[PDB]
Amino acid sequence: GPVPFSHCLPTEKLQRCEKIGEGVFGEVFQTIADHTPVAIKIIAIEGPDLVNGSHQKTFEEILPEIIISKELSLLSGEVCNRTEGFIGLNSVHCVQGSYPPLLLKAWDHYNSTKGSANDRPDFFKDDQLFIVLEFEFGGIDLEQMRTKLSSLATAKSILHQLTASLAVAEASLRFEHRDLHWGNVLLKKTSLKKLHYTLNGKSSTIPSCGLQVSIIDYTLSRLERDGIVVFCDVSMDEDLFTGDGDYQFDIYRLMKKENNNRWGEYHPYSNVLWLHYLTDKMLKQMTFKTKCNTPAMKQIKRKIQEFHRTMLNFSSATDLLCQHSLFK
Numbered sequence: 001g002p003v004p005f006s007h008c009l010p011t012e013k014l015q016r017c018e019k020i021g022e023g024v025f026g027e028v029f030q031t032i033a034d035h036t037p038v039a040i041k042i043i044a045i046e047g048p049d050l051v052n053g054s055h056q057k058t059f060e061e062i063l064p065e066i067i068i069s070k071e072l073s074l075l076s077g078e079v080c081n082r083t084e085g086f087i088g089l090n091s092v093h094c095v096q097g098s099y100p101p102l103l104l105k106a107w108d109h110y111n112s113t114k115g116s117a118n119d120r121p122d123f124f125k126d127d128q129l130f131i132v133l134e135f136e137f138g139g140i141d142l143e144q145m146r147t148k149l150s151s152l153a154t155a156k157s158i159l160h161q162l163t164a165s166l167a168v169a170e171a172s173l174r175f176e177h178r179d180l181h182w183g184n185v186l187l188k189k190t191s192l193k194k195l196h197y198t199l200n201g202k203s204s205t206i207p208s209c210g211l212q213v214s215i216i217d218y219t220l221s222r223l224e225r226d227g228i229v230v231f232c233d234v235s236m237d238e239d240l241f242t243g244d245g246d247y248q249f250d251i252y253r254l255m256k257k258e259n260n261n262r263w264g265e266y267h268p269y270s271n272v273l274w275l276h277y278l279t280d281k282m283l284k285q286m287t288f289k290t291k292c293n294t295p296a297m298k299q300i301k302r303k304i305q306e307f308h309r310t311m312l313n314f315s316s317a318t319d320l321l322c323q324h325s326l327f328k
């Protein structure tokens with residue numbers, strides 16, 4: 001059956017919770033257990049109350065995110081198709097109860113300093129169900145790092161980490177992220193110079209430039225094992241395809257064109273679209289502490305422009321990884 005919040009967040013862990021993120025879906029908290037930071041994603045399910053102005057998902061509607069989080073976490077421990085480029089999933093729990101007052105306290109501090117688009121989650125009764133996803137702490141998203149990266153050299157490492165991770169997932173799981181906006185790319189300092197991946201049994205390395213990328217948030221994602229497909233059917237969604245003000249909202253339209261509004265099919269070009277969006281973000285909205293002033297740097301800049309100009313003529317992240325000149 002379900003367990004109380006205390007099962008997931010004993011006193012200690014609860015008292016150390018800071019809010020780090022939010023969406024229509026719910027709330028993300030940072031905390032510490034065994035000296036180790038973790039992120040807690042908390043989602044209300046099965047209830048009749050609107051939350052942040054939308055209906056709660058049923059268990060059946062939240063399953064696909066649970067399944068896909070697990071599958072992509074497991075790639076860190078595989079052999080033929082191995083990557084750490086997704087986020088480690090420590091645990092999943094179904095929780096019953098009102099929202100812990102100590103989580104409300106973390107929620108209020110966030111609302112005060114940063115401000116929130118969400119309802120104060122203080123209106124839940126003691127029968128309310130939540131899914132609690134605990135992740136390894138993956139760092140801070142690429143959006144919030146807009147002005148924080150050192151040079152375009154770092155950009156190349158990020159795009160390489162992202163392409164390799166998506167390629168490994170393509171080969172293993174026929175995976176599409178389908179919502180890889182720069183909010184869903186996390187960066188973390190690493191003292192490792194090379195990062196390792198295996199694709200179809202063949203191991204290579206990517207220079208880190210002191211960063212480790214983690215792809216998050218599998219709420220729109222798709223994959224399959226033994227011809228069983230797990231996905232979010234957005235065939236009948238309206239709002240997803242009517243956004244503007246950012247290349248992001250074009251990718252929703254361009255995905256729907258590629259797959260003729262059939263979201264069960266495998267179209268790995270969706271990964272190429274998102275990688276083009278991210279490459280576009282690197283050149284147009286990221287600003288670096290050190291511009292390209294030396295000759296070897298202006299080369300890296302030209303190769304990323306060339307990437308941006310060409311990558312849409314590749315059929316998958318796999319095709320990019322193995323055929324694009326940026327990665328030779």
Ligand SMILES: CSc1ncc2cc3cnccc3c([N+](=O)[O-])c2n1
Pocket residue numbers: 020021022023028038039040041087135136137138139140186216217
């Ligand atoms: C879904 S919005 C969000 N905002 C911020 C986050 C930060 C995270 C840090 N580390 C690991 C996971 C993290 C997640 N997540 O996957 O739910 C985050 N999610």
